[PDB]
Structures are given as structure tokens and as C-alpha cells.
Amino acid sequence: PQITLWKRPLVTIKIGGQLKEALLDTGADDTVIEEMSLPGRWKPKMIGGIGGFIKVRQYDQIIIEIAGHKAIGTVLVGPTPVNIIGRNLLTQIGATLNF
Amino acid sequence: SFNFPQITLWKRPLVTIKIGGQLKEALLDTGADDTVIEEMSLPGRWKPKMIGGIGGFIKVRQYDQIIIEIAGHKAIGTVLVGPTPVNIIGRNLLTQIGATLNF
Ligand SMILES: CC(C)(C)NC(=O)[C@@H]1C[C@@H]2CCCC[C@@H]2CN1C[C@@H](O)[C@H](Cc1ccccc1)NC(=O)[C@H](CC(N)=O)NC(=O)c1ccc2ccccc2n1
Ligand SMILES: [Cl-]
Ligand SMILES: [Cl-]
């Protein structure tokens, strides 16, 4: 619960019965995780980053545990190089950025 | 506090920065290794670099030892200049203003 930024802020997540590592990312609007199957229905979405846009699958109301905190919300699945926890779920677990 | 704000993440964590004499808005971004600013003029030597993120890579100019004011806090470090859609303050400078994640 107090994470400095001299290293990447990586945490463990539990999603679709798997443990994975993910990046706590205040610069991401959305949560984007590498290809895997999830227990739900999806719809298409386009999202942008540095370097253009990618197609992802949008899964709503997904149960995901981040550093032991449970969230239930939208997870995007697509060709990201790193699993990213964005503000939609950072807010659910009560994360803040402090000076 | 006003001098050391606790920033909630309901909205994008945007702040005012001053760089190269100019005021700009930038994103405080714990998920970025580097600080990347839109095309602008900076002094000194630079070297070309490729940096990547979600969509792929962009070519930037790397400048070292740049002074930047971030929400009124002084930080010095490398700044990459290039075709980023959003100015972002990455971990190399967030550490210099004592930023932490808390939950
Ligand atoms: C994740 C998504 C919802 C698409 N949002 C974003 O990606 C938004 C888009 C915004 C507008 C365009 C400019 C970027 C800002 C902030 N970003 C969030 C932002 O936090 C984003 C998230 C991220 C992390 C790691 C890998 C990829 C993507 N970081 C980045 O784009 C930074 C840029 C940099 N410093 O070089 N990338 C990295 O720090 C980084 C780290 C490891 C990597 C490994 C392999 C390939 C690329 C890698 N890039
Ligand atoms: Cl959500
Ligand atoms: Cl630096």
C-alpha cells in the first residue's frame, strides 16, 4: 500500500482463475490484459496509446483481484505487451497518487 | 495538502508543468518509464530513440538534464520529445517529486 516509483509498480492480480503480474498505471483510462479467455461475453473496442490504436475485446463486469483487493468492472483483452491496471479499477481499490 | 496533493483517479491526473520556458498540461503516469512531451524546442544535444507503448513505437529526441517544474515541484531528468498524443510525466521524473501510489 505505499509504492514508490523507482521501479515499475507491478503487483499480482487474480483473474479468470490465474495469477498474473500487472502494472498500476495512473496514465491509463482502461485496464488492458494480454490475451487469455475470460468468463464472459465481450464486445469490440478500439483503444489508443503511444503509438496508435489496437483492437481489443471489452469484457464488462469481470471479477479481478488486484494486490488482494477485489474489483468488479471492465477488462479489455488484446495485444498489449504488459498487463495494465488503469483508473477504472484503480479507483475501485481506492488507489491514489500522492506527492 | 495543497503543497503535497493526494490525487484521486476519478479523472485523468493532469497537472500544469513548466518546461523550456513554457507552460503545458501533462499526465502524471505511473505506467510510463519515461517522460514524453509533444514536439517542442529544447536546448542542447539530443539523440534519436524509439520508444514503445500500446499501438507500437514512435521516434523521439532524447534530451538529458532538463529542468521541469511539475505542479510547482522541481524535477531534473531526461525528456523525450516527439509525436505523443498526450504529454506524460513518467517515473523518471515522478520519483524526483516524491510521488507514491497508495491504497
Ligand atoms: C493502456 C491504454 C488504456 C491504451 N492507455 C495508454 O496506453 C495511455 C495512452 C495515453 C495517450 C497516448 C500517450 C500515452 C498516454 C498514457 N498511456 C498510458 C501509459 O501509462 C502507457 C501504458 C503502457 C505501459 C507499458 C506498456 C505499454 C503501455 N505507457 C507507455 O506508453 C510507456 C511509454 C514510455 N515511457 O516509453 N511505455 C512504457 O513505459 C513501456 C514499458 C515496457 C514496455 C515493454 C514492451 C514494449 C513497450 C513497453 N513500454
Ligand atoms: Cl469499470
Ligand atoms: Cl532521467
Side-chain angles (χ1 to χ4, degrees), chain A residues 50, chain B residues 36-37 46-51 58-63 79-84:
Chain A
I50 247 158
Chain B
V36 192
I37 304 295
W46 51 270
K47 28 222 210 256
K49 186 179 165 80
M50 293 286 272
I51 59 172
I58 60 167
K59 182 179 69 163
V60 295
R61 304 197 300 283
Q62 173 184 333
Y63 293 86
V79 174
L80 307 182
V81 176
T84 176

PDB file of all heavy atoms in Angstrom, chain A residues 50, chain B residues 36-37 46-51 58-63 79-84:
ATOM      1  N   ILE A  50       0.447   5.208 -27.059  1.00  0.00           N
ATOM      2  CA  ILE A  50       1.588   5.760 -27.804  1.00  0.00           C
ATOM      3  C   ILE A  50       1.773   4.756 -28.949  1.00  0.00           C
ATOM      4  O   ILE A  50       1.726   3.535 -28.726  1.00  0.00           O
ATOM      5  CB  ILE A  50       2.862   5.961 -26.999  1.00  0.00           C
ATOM      6  CG1 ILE A  50       3.347   7.426 -26.764  1.00  0.00           C
ATOM      7  CG2 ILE A  50       4.048   5.315 -27.698  1.00  0.00           C
ATOM      8  CD1 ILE A  50       4.252   7.448 -25.547  1.00  0.00           C
TER       9      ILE A  50
ATOM     10  N   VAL B  36       7.528  11.958 -21.849  1.00  0.00           N
ATOM     11  CA  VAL B  36       7.437  12.193 -23.292  1.00  0.00           C
ATOM     12  C   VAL B  36       6.587  13.427 -23.530  1.00  0.00           C
ATOM     13  O   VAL B  36       5.456  13.441 -23.042  1.00  0.00           O
ATOM     14  CB  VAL B  36       6.865  10.965 -24.055  1.00  0.00           C
ATOM     15  CG1 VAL B  36       7.071  11.180 -25.555  1.00  0.00           C
ATOM     16  CG2 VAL B  36       7.502   9.678 -23.573  1.00  0.00           C
ATOM     17  N   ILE B  37       7.161  14.382 -24.235  1.00  0.00           N
ATOM     18  CA  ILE B  37       6.458  15.662 -24.434  1.00  0.00           C
ATOM     19  C   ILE B  37       6.272  15.864 -25.929  1.00  0.00           C
ATOM     20  O   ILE B  37       7.137  15.469 -26.720  1.00  0.00           O
ATOM     21  CB  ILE B  37       7.282  16.802 -23.773  1.00  0.00           C
ATOM     22  CG1 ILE B  37       7.566  16.565 -22.273  1.00  0.00           C
ATOM     23  CG2 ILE B  37       6.571  18.138 -23.950  1.00  0.00           C
ATOM     24  CD1 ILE B  37       6.269  16.582 -21.453  1.00  0.00           C
ATOM     25  N   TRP B  46      20.916  16.186 -28.659  1.00  0.00           N
ATOM     26  CA  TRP B  46      19.931  15.127 -28.370  1.00  0.00           C
ATOM     27  C   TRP B  46      20.345  13.861 -29.093  1.00  0.00           C
ATOM     28  O   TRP B  46      21.256  13.935 -29.919  1.00  0.00           O
ATOM     29  CB  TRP B  46      18.497  15.589 -28.733  1.00  0.00           C
ATOM     30  CG  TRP B  46      18.434  16.145 -30.127  1.00  0.00           C
ATOM     31  CD1 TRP B  46      18.620  17.444 -30.540  1.00  0.00           C
ATOM     32  CD2 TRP B  46      18.159  15.395 -31.303  1.00  0.00           C
ATOM     33  NE1 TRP B  46      18.481  17.574 -31.909  1.00  0.00           N
ATOM     34  CE2 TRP B  46      18.196  16.297 -32.388  1.00  0.00           C
ATOM     35  CE3 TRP B  46      17.892  14.052 -31.556  1.00  0.00           C
ATOM     36  CZ2 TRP B  46      17.964  15.843 -33.691  1.00  0.00           C
ATOM     37  CZ3 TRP B  46      17.658  13.603 -32.848  1.00  0.00           C
ATOM     38  CH2 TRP B  46      17.694  14.511 -33.931  1.00  0.00           C
ATOM     39  N   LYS B  47      19.701  12.715 -28.848  1.00  0.00           N
ATOM     40  CA  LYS B  47      19.950  11.536 -29.644  1.00  0.00           C
ATOM     41  C   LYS B  47      18.595  10.920 -29.991  1.00  0.00           C
ATOM     42  O   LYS B  47      17.667  11.013 -29.180  1.00  0.00           O
ATOM     43  CB  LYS B  47      20.760  10.450 -28.947  1.00  0.00           C
ATOM     44  CG  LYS B  47      20.533  10.516 -27.442  1.00  0.00           C
ATOM     45  CD  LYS B  47      21.857  10.317 -26.712  1.00  0.00           C
ATOM     46  CE  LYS B  47      21.560   9.668 -25.369  1.00  0.00           C
ATOM     47  NZ  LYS B  47      21.643  10.603 -24.212  1.00  0.00           N
ATOM     48  N   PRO B  48      18.514  10.341 -31.170  1.00  0.00           N
ATOM     49  CA  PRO B  48      17.232   9.755 -31.568  1.00  0.00           C
ATOM     50  C   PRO B  48      17.028   8.471 -30.801  1.00  0.00           C
ATOM     51  O   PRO B  48      18.009   7.761 -30.524  1.00  0.00           O
ATOM     52  CB  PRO B  48      17.410   9.475 -33.057  1.00  0.00           C
ATOM     53  CG  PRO B  48      18.887   9.288 -33.228  1.00  0.00           C
ATOM     54  CD  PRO B  48      19.543  10.202 -32.223  1.00  0.00           C
ATOM     55  N   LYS B  49      15.775   8.223 -30.484  1.00  0.00           N
ATOM     56  CA  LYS B  49      15.403   6.987 -29.776  1.00  0.00           C
ATOM     57  C   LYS B  49      14.043   6.467 -30.251  1.00  0.00           C
ATOM     58  O   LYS B  49      13.217   7.267 -30.692  1.00  0.00           O
ATOM     59  CB  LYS B  49      15.379   7.313 -28.272  1.00  0.00           C
ATOM     60  CG  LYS B  49      15.149   6.166 -27.328  1.00  0.00           C
ATOM     61  CD  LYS B  49      15.179   6.613 -25.882  1.00  0.00           C
ATOM     62  CE  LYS B  49      14.604   5.564 -24.945  1.00  0.00           C
ATOM     63  NZ  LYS B  49      15.533   4.462 -24.602  1.00  0.00           N
ATOM     64  N   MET B  50      13.801   5.155 -30.190  1.00  0.00           N
ATOM     65  CA  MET B  50      12.492   4.570 -30.415  1.00  0.00           C
ATOM     66  C   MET B  50      11.885   4.160 -29.062  1.00  0.00           C
ATOM     67  O   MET B  50      12.585   3.474 -28.297  1.00  0.00           O
ATOM     68  CB  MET B  50      12.555   3.347 -31.328  1.00  0.00           C
ATOM     69  CG  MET B  50      12.973   3.671 -32.771  1.00  0.00           C
ATOM     70  SD  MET B  50      11.587   4.481 -33.638  1.00  0.00           S
ATOM     71  CE  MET B  50      10.789   2.943 -34.224  1.00  0.00           C
ATOM     72  N   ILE B  51      10.650   4.569 -28.821  1.00  0.00           N
ATOM     73  CA  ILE B  51      10.015   4.172 -27.580  1.00  0.00           C
ATOM     74  C   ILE B  51       8.661   3.554 -27.908  1.00  0.00           C
ATOM     75  O   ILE B  51       8.060   3.923 -28.905  1.00  0.00           O
ATOM     76  CB  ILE B  51       9.826   5.308 -26.556  1.00  0.00           C
ATOM     77  CG1 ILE B  51       8.974   6.455 -27.111  1.00  0.00           C
ATOM     78  CG2 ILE B  51      11.170   5.795 -26.056  1.00  0.00           C
ATOM     79  CD1 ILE B  51       8.574   7.528 -26.150  1.00  0.00           C
ATOM     80  N   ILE B  58       7.183   4.943 -31.499  1.00  0.00           N
ATOM     81  CA  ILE B  58       7.381   6.263 -32.093  1.00  0.00           C
ATOM     82  C   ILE B  58       8.843   6.656 -31.921  1.00  0.00           C
ATOM     83  O   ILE B  58       9.550   6.226 -30.971  1.00  0.00           O
ATOM     84  CB  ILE B  58       6.477   7.351 -31.480  1.00  0.00           C
ATOM     85  CG1 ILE B  58       6.706   7.549 -29.980  1.00  0.00           C
ATOM     86  CG2 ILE B  58       5.029   7.001 -31.730  1.00  0.00           C
ATOM     87  CD1 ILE B  58       6.048   8.820 -29.494  1.00  0.00           C
ATOM     88  N   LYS B  59       9.287   7.485 -32.862  1.00  0.00           N
ATOM     89  CA  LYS B  59      10.657   8.026 -32.807  1.00  0.00           C
ATOM     90  C   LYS B  59      10.629   9.357 -32.055  1.00  0.00           C
ATOM     91  O   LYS B  59       9.797  10.238 -32.327  1.00  0.00           O
ATOM     92  CB  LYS B  59      11.208   8.180 -34.226  1.00  0.00           C
ATOM     93  CG  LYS B  59      12.651   8.690 -34.241  1.00  0.00           C
ATOM     94  CD  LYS B  59      13.124   8.784 -35.682  1.00  0.00           C
ATOM     95  CE  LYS B  59      12.415   9.882 -36.438  1.00  0.00           C
ATOM     96  NZ  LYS B  59      13.132  10.263 -37.706  1.00  0.00           N
ATOM     97  N   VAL B  60      11.556   9.496 -31.098  1.00  0.00           N
ATOM     98  CA  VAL B  60      11.637  10.711 -30.300  1.00  0.00           C
ATOM     99  C   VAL B  60      13.068  11.231 -30.262  1.00  0.00           C
ATOM    100  O   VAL B  60      14.013  10.572 -30.705  1.00  0.00           O
ATOM    101  CB  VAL B  60      11.157  10.420 -28.860  1.00  0.00           C
ATOM    102  CG1 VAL B  60       9.688  10.040 -28.852  1.00  0.00           C
ATOM    103  CG2 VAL B  60      12.000   9.310 -28.218  1.00  0.00           C
ATOM    104  N   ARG B  61      13.231  12.444 -29.756  1.00  0.00           N
ATOM    105  CA  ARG B  61      14.525  13.047 -29.487  1.00  0.00           C
ATOM    106  C   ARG B  61      14.777  13.016 -27.997  1.00  0.00           C
ATOM    107  O   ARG B  61      13.941  13.498 -27.232  1.00  0.00           O
ATOM    108  CB  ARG B  61      14.595  14.500 -29.975  1.00  0.00           C
ATOM    109  CG  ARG B  61      14.264  14.609 -31.470  1.00  0.00           C
ATOM    110  CD  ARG B  61      14.734  15.952 -32.010  1.00  0.00           C
ATOM    111  NE  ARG B  61      14.112  17.074 -31.330  1.00  0.00           N
ATOM    112  CZ  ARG B  61      12.911  17.606 -31.431  1.00  0.00           C
ATOM    113  NH1 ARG B  61      12.013  17.097 -32.283  1.00  0.00           N
ATOM    114  NH2 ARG B  61      12.622  18.659 -30.661  1.00  0.00           N
ATOM    115  N   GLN B  62      15.911  12.420 -27.596  1.00  0.00           N
ATOM    116  CA  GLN B  62      16.181  12.370 -26.186  1.00  0.00           C
ATOM    117  C   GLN B  62      17.095  13.499 -25.729  1.00  0.00           C
ATOM    118  O   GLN B  62      18.206  13.651 -26.218  1.00  0.00           O
ATOM    119  CB  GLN B  62      16.856  11.024 -25.833  1.00  0.00           C
ATOM    120  CG  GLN B  62      17.336  10.959 -24.400  1.00  0.00           C
ATOM    121  CD  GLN B  62      18.075   9.690 -24.070  1.00  0.00           C
ATOM    122  OE1 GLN B  62      17.833   8.677 -24.704  1.00  0.00           O
ATOM    123  NE2 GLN B  62      18.967   9.737 -23.081  1.00  0.00           N
ATOM    124  N   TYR B  63      16.623  14.303 -24.793  1.00  0.00           N
ATOM    125  CA  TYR B  63      17.368  15.389 -24.153  1.00  0.00           C
ATOM    126  C   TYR B  63      17.661  15.055 -22.709  1.00  0.00           C
ATOM    127  O   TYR B  63      16.733  14.685 -21.973  1.00  0.00           O
ATOM    128  CB  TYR B  63      16.531  16.678 -24.212  1.00  0.00           C
ATOM    129  CG  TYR B  63      16.319  17.239 -25.593  1.00  0.00           C
ATOM    130  CD1 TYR B  63      15.252  16.772 -26.366  1.00  0.00           C
ATOM    131  CD2 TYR B  63      17.155  18.233 -26.108  1.00  0.00           C
ATOM    132  CE1 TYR B  63      15.005  17.265 -27.630  1.00  0.00           C
ATOM    133  CE2 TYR B  63      16.912  18.720 -27.394  1.00  0.00           C
ATOM    134  CZ  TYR B  63      15.851  18.230 -28.143  1.00  0.00           C
ATOM    135  OH  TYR B  63      15.593  18.718 -29.417  1.00  0.00           O
ATOM    136  N   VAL B  79      14.132  14.072 -20.881  1.00  0.00           N
ATOM    137  CA  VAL B  79      12.845  14.324 -21.517  1.00  0.00           C
ATOM    138  C   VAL B  79      12.923  13.874 -22.959  1.00  0.00           C
ATOM    139  O   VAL B  79      13.911  14.194 -23.674  1.00  0.00           O
ATOM    140  CB  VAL B  79      12.472  15.821 -21.419  1.00  0.00           C
ATOM    141  CG1 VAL B  79      11.202  16.167 -22.205  1.00  0.00           C
ATOM    142  CG2 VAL B  79      12.281  16.152 -19.947  1.00  0.00           C
ATOM    143  N   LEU B  80      11.918  13.135 -23.395  1.00  0.00           N
ATOM    144  CA  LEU B  80      11.859  12.653 -24.783  1.00  0.00           C
ATOM    145  C   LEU B  80      10.859  13.537 -25.512  1.00  0.00           C
ATOM    146  O   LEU B  80       9.761  13.732 -24.960  1.00  0.00           O
ATOM    147  CB  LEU B  80      11.406  11.180 -24.834  1.00  0.00           C
ATOM    148  CG  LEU B  80      12.246  10.232 -23.944  1.00  0.00           C
ATOM    149  CD1 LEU B  80      11.771   8.798 -24.095  1.00  0.00           C
ATOM    150  CD2 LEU B  80      13.722  10.324 -24.307  1.00  0.00           C
ATOM    151  N   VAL B  81      11.220  14.043 -26.667  1.00  0.00           N
ATOM    152  CA  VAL B  81      10.311  14.914 -27.407  1.00  0.00           C
ATOM    153  C   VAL B  81       9.892  14.260 -28.714  1.00  0.00           C
ATOM    154  O   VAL B  81      10.746  13.763 -29.471  1.00  0.00           O
ATOM    155  CB  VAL B  81      10.991  16.271 -27.729  1.00  0.00           C
ATOM    156  CG1 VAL B  81      10.112  17.154 -28.577  1.00  0.00           C
ATOM    157  CG2 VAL B  81      11.336  16.954 -26.414  1.00  0.00           C
ATOM    158  N   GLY B  82       8.587  14.217 -28.994  1.00  0.00           N
ATOM    159  CA  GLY B  82       8.160  13.566 -30.222  1.00  0.00           C
ATOM    160  C   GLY B  82       6.645  13.470 -30.292  1.00  0.00           C
ATOM    161  O   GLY B  82       5.938  14.132 -29.526  1.00  0.00           O
ATOM    162  N   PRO B  83       6.184  12.645 -31.235  1.00  0.00           N
ATOM    163  CA  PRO B  83       4.768  12.642 -31.610  1.00  0.00           C
ATOM    164  C   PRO B  83       3.870  11.827 -30.676  1.00  0.00           C
ATOM    165  O   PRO B  83       3.100  10.948 -31.070  1.00  0.00           O
ATOM    166  CB  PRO B  83       4.812  12.062 -33.029  1.00  0.00           C
ATOM    167  CG  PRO B  83       5.994  11.118 -33.005  1.00  0.00           C
ATOM    168  CD  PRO B  83       6.996  11.764 -32.083  1.00  0.00           C
ATOM    169  N   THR B  84       3.935  12.183 -29.402  1.00  0.00           N
ATOM    170  CA  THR B  84       2.992  11.623 -28.440  1.00  0.00           C
ATOM    171  C   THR B  84       1.718  12.463 -28.471  1.00  0.00           C
ATOM    172  O   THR B  84       1.716  13.676 -28.598  1.00  0.00           O
ATOM    173  CB  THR B  84       3.563  11.642 -27.021  1.00  0.00           C
ATOM    174  OG1 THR B  84       2.538  11.158 -26.137  1.00  0.00           O
ATOM    175  CG2 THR B  84       3.946  13.053 -26.591  1.00  0.00           C
TER     176      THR B  84
END
